[PDB]
Design a protein around this motif. Structure first.
Motif, mmCIF file in Angstrom:
data_model
loop_
_atom_site.group_PDB
_atom_site.id
_atom_site.type_symbol
_atom_site.label_atom_id
_atom_site.label_comp_id
_atom_site.label_asym_id
_atom_site.label_seq_id
_atom_site.Cartn_x
_atom_site.Cartn_y
_atom_site.Cartn_z
ATOM 1 N N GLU A 7 0.811 -1.223 0.000
ATOM 2 C CA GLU A 7 0.000 0.000 0.000
ATOM 3 C C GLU A 7 0.851 1.282 0.000
ATOM 4 O O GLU A 7 0.517 2.255 -0.677
ATOM 5 C CB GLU A 7 -0.931 -0.006 1.219
ATOM 6 C CG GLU A 7 -1.757 -1.273 1.358
ATOM 7 C CD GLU A 7 -2.104 -1.656 2.786
ATOM 8 O OE1 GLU A 7 -1.204 -1.596 3.656
ATOM 9 O OE2 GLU A 7 -3.272 -2.031 3.031
ATOM 10 N N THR A 8 1.991 1.232 0.706
ATOM 11 C CA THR A 8 2.929 2.346 0.842
ATOM 12 C C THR A 8 3.913 2.519 -0.323
ATOM 13 O O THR A 8 4.769 3.400 -0.258
ATOM 14 C CB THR A 8 3.690 2.227 2.164
ATOM 15 O OG1 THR A 8 4.300 0.935 2.232
ATOM 16 C CG2 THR A 8 2.792 2.447 3.377
ATOM 17 N N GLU A 9 3.815 1.687 -1.368
ATOM 18 C CA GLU A 9 4.698 1.780 -2.527
ATOM 19 C C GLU A 9 4.174 2.789 -3.540
ATOM 20 O O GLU A 9 4.964 3.473 -4.179
ATOM 21 C CB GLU A 9 4.856 0.411 -3.206
ATOM 22 C CG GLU A 9 6.101 -0.359 -2.805
ATOM 23 C CD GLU A 9 6.289 -1.683 -3.525
ATOM 24 O OE1 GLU A 9 6.989 -1.707 -4.563
ATOM 25 O OE2 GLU A 9 5.752 -2.704 -3.039
ATOM 26 N N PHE A 10 2.851 2.880 -3.696
ATOM 27 C CA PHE A 10 2.256 3.772 -4.686
ATOM 28 C C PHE A 10 1.336 4.857 -4.124
ATOM 29 O O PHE A 10 0.681 4.667 -3.091
ATOM 30 C CB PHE A 10 1.512 2.967 -5.756
ATOM 31 C CG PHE A 10 0.390 2.102 -5.227
ATOM 32 C CD1 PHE A 10 0.654 0.863 -4.666
ATOM 33 C CD2 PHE A 10 -0.927 2.505 -5.333
ATOM 34 C CE1 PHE A 10 -0.374 0.064 -4.192
ATOM 35 C CE2 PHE A 10 -1.956 1.696 -4.869
ATOM 36 C CZ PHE A 10 -1.673 0.484 -4.298
ATOM 37 N N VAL A 24 -9.879 4.433 -12.421
ATOM 38 C CA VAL A 24 -8.511 4.403 -12.934
ATOM 39 C C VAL A 24 -7.874 5.682 -12.422
ATOM 40 O O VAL A 24 -8.414 6.751 -12.688
ATOM 41 C CB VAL A 24 -8.382 4.317 -14.473
ATOM 42 C CG1 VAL A 24 -6.923 4.119 -14.869
ATOM 43 C CG2 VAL A 24 -9.243 3.203 -15.050
ATOM 44 N N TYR A 25 -6.767 5.595 -11.661
ATOM 45 C CA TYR A 25 -6.132 6.795 -11.114
ATOM 46 C C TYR A 25 -4.737 7.031 -11.647
ATOM 47 O O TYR A 25 -3.923 6.129 -11.588
ATOM 48 C CB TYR A 25 -5.967 6.701 -9.590
ATOM 49 C CG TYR A 25 -7.127 6.137 -8.804
ATOM 50 C CD1 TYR A 25 -6.989 4.968 -8.076
ATOM 51 C CD2 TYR A 25 -8.307 6.850 -8.667
ATOM 52 C CE1 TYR A 25 -8.016 4.490 -7.278
ATOM 53 C CE2 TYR A 25 -9.349 6.377 -7.879
ATOM 54 C CZ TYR A 25 -9.205 5.187 -7.195
ATOM 55 O OH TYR A 25 -10.227 4.704 -6.414
ATOM 56 N N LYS A 26 -4.410 8.265 -12.033
ATOM 57 C CA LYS A 26 -3.040 8.626 -12.404
ATOM 58 C C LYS A 26 -2.284 8.720 -11.063
ATOM 59 O O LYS A 26 -2.902 9.076 -10.061
ATOM 60 C CB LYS A 26 -3.050 9.992 -13.106
ATOM 61 C CG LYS A 26 -1.722 10.444 -13.700
ATOM 62 C CD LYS A 26 -1.949 11.501 -14.796
ATOM 63 C CE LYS A 26 -0.744 12.367 -15.097
ATOM 64 N NZ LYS A 26 -0.891 13.101 -16.387
ATOM 65 N N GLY A 27 -1.000 8.356 -11.022
ATOM 66 C CA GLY A 27 -0.256 8.400 -9.764
ATOM 67 C C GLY A 27 1.231 8.144 -9.838
ATOM 68 O O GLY A 27 1.801 8.056 -10.926
ATOM 69 N N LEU A 28 1.876 8.025 -8.667
ATOM 70 C CA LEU A 28 3.316 7.785 -8.613
ATOM 71 C C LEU A 28 3.709 6.542 -7.809
ATOM 72 O O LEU A 28 3.546 6.507 -6.587
ATOM 73 C CB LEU A 28 4.052 9.015 -8.074
ATOM 74 C CG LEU A 28 5.549 9.040 -8.385
ATOM 75 C CD1 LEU A 28 5.793 9.285 -9.869
ATOM 76 C CD2 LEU A 28 6.275 10.076 -7.528
ATOM 77 N N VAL A 36 13.636 5.345 -8.047
ATOM 78 C CA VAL A 36 12.926 5.799 -9.251
ATOM 79 C C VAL A 36 11.430 6.046 -9.029
ATOM 80 O O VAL A 36 10.716 5.170 -8.544
ATOM 81 C CB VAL A 36 13.146 4.893 -10.497
ATOM 82 C CG1 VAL A 36 14.353 5.345 -11.308
ATOM 83 C CG2 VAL A 36 13.241 3.415 -10.129
ATOM 84 N N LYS A 37 10.962 7.242 -9.422
ATOM 85 C CA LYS A 37 9.555 7.635 -9.337
ATOM 86 C C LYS A 37 8.912 7.210 -10.669
ATOM 87 O O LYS A 37 9.437 7.560 -11.728
ATOM 88 C CB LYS A 37 9.430 9.162 -9.160
ATOM 89 C CG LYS A 37 10.379 9.791 -8.140
ATOM 90 C CD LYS A 37 10.323 11.327 -8.198
ATOM 91 C CE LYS A 37 11.377 12.009 -7.350
ATOM 92 N NZ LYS A 37 11.011 12.063 -5.908
ATOM 93 N N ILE A 38 7.818 6.425 -10.632
ATOM 94 C CA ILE A 38 7.211 5.923 -11.867
ATOM 95 C C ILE A 38 5.795 6.423 -12.129
ATOM 96 O O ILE A 38 4.895 6.184 -11.328
ATOM 97 C CB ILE A 38 7.248 4.374 -11.904
ATOM 98 C CG1 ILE A 38 8.634 3.816 -11.566
ATOM 99 C CG2 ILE A 38 6.759 3.847 -13.235
ATOM 100 C CD1 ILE A 38 8.622 2.393 -11.244
ATOM 101 N N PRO A 39 5.564 7.065 -13.282
ATOM 102 C CA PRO A 39 4.198 7.498 -13.614
ATOM 103 C C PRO A 39 3.310 6.295 -13.953
ATOM 104 O O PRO A 39 3.512 5.622 -14.966
ATOM 105 C CB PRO A 39 4.397 8.430 -14.811
ATOM 106 C CG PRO A 39 5.672 7.989 -15.434
ATOM 107 C CD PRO A 39 6.530 7.410 -14.342
ATOM 108 N N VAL A 40 2.354 5.992 -13.071
ATOM 109 C CA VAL A 40 1.491 4.830 -13.243
ATOM 110 C C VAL A 40 -0.005 5.169 -13.320
ATOM 111 O O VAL A 40 -0.422 6.259 -12.942
ATOM 112 C CB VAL A 40 1.766 3.786 -12.124
ATOM 113 C CG1 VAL A 40 3.210 3.283 -12.161
ATOM 114 C CG2 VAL A 40 1.394 4.336 -10.748
ATOM 115 N N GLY A 80 2.609 -4.104 -11.842
ATOM 116 C CA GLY A 80 2.468 -4.663 -10.509
ATOM 117 C C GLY A 80 1.047 -4.706 -10.002
ATOM 118 O O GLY A 80 0.183 -3.971 -10.482
ATOM 119 N N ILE A 81 0.793 -5.580 -9.031
ATOM 120 C CA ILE A 81 -0.546 -5.737 -8.499
ATOM 121 C C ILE A 81 -0.589 -5.504 -7.001
ATOM 122 O O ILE A 81 0.340 -5.850 -6.271
ATOM 123 C CB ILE A 81 -1.147 -7.100 -8.918
ATOM 124 C CG1 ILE A 81 -2.676 -7.134 -8.707
ATOM 125 C CG2 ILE A 81 -0.425 -8.276 -8.241
ATOM 126 C CD1 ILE A 81 -3.361 -8.413 -9.159
#
Ligand SMILES: *CCC(=O)N1Cc2nc(-c3cccc(/C=C/c4ncc(C5CC5)o4)c3)n(-c3ccncc3)c2C1
Length: 273
Positions: A7-10, A24-28, A36-40, A80-81
């Protein structure tokens, strides 16, 4: 392969969109051991949908994560899930959403090469699923995503197989008996091509879902769009045959649509061109 996101990864930002399925949410997303910060994009799936347990879902997600190797440029990769009470799916963020919205918002600027090559890429990726025996079940222009206007991908494959409805995209054997095969996705591909050729038009517009089943028995299929030549409509109507084996394979469509792209002015009639 596929990370198990704590839960604390994204993090979550704007809701890119919300449907019946969930959100569907835009996020980091920051991985377990990296700076590394990933646009997910986080597909929040609604609770109490799968009868399967969270463990039964997780192991099945790892099986569907095999398709990501060697991979195809026209099939998405599940970054990732996350499994809390809900199933949250994390992939790389497509800024240009899905193809359905794109072909609607850019209808007039969309050319014949752009259109025919989209059919090409989609068939290439759809064939790649058939190579790994993964049946998509839900192929539509809204499930085709855009990375760049010249590069599209397929998403939401085997998500029904993961947890168990578009009747207008489904073939007769799916509408009546819910039997999904790789040939069923050729019918859904046929609907998807018509959707692109109608710049986001609703398949069988207005016609209620209950009618569709018996309406297809009466022989009526989707009407031919005014931009398709007779040669293109034979391919769309080939995919809508009653027998599954009468419809073509994704290998055949890759060759045909690329042959068609070798003179698009002979297969699509529009302005600017
Ligand atoms: C026109 C816009 C639109 O309708 N869409 C649909 C959509 N879905 C997603 C998205 C977001 C996150 C995760 C996923 C899919 C994960 C998936 N599919 C299959 C599997 C594994 C095999 C079991 O995992 C889909 N987006 C999206 C994607 C990226 N950035 C933004 C939006 C859209 C756009």
């Amino acid at each position: 392969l596929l990370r198990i996101l704590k839960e604390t990864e994204f993090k979550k930002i704007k809701v890119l969109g919300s449907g019946a399925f969930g959100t569907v949410y835009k996020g980091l997303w920051i991985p377990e051991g990296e700076k590394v910060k990933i646009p997910v994009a986080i597909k929040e799936l609604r609770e109490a949908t799968s009868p399967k347990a969270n463990k039964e879902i997780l192991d099945e997600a790892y099986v569907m994560a095999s398709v990501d190797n060697p991979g195809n440029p026209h099939v998405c990769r599940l970054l990732g899930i996350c499994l809390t009470s809900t199933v949250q799916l994390i992939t790389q963020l497509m800024p240009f959403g899905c193809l359905l919205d794109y072909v609607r918002e850019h209808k007039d600027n969309i050319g014949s090469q752009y259109l025919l090559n989209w059919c090409v890429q989609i068939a290439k990726g759809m064939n790649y699923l058939e190579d790994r025996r993964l049946v998509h079940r839900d192929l539509a222009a809204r499930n085709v995503l855009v990375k760049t206007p010249q590069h599209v991908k397929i998403t939401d494959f085997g998500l029904a197989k993961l947890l168990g409805v578009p009747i207008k995209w489904m073939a007769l054997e799916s509408i009546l008996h819910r039997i999904y095969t790789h040939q069923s996705d050729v019918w859904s591909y046929g609907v998807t091509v018509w959707e692109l050729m109608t710049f986001g038009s609703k398949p069988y517009d207005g016609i209620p879902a209950s009618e569709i089943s018996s309406i297809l028995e009466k022989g009526e299929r989707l009407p031919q769009p005014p931009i398709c030549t007779i040669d293109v409509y034979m391919i769309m109507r080939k995919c809508w045959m009653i027998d599954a084996d009468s419809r073509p394979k994704f290998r055949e469509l890759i060759i045909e649509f690329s042959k068609m792209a070798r003179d698009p002015q002979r297969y699509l009639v529009i302005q600017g061109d």
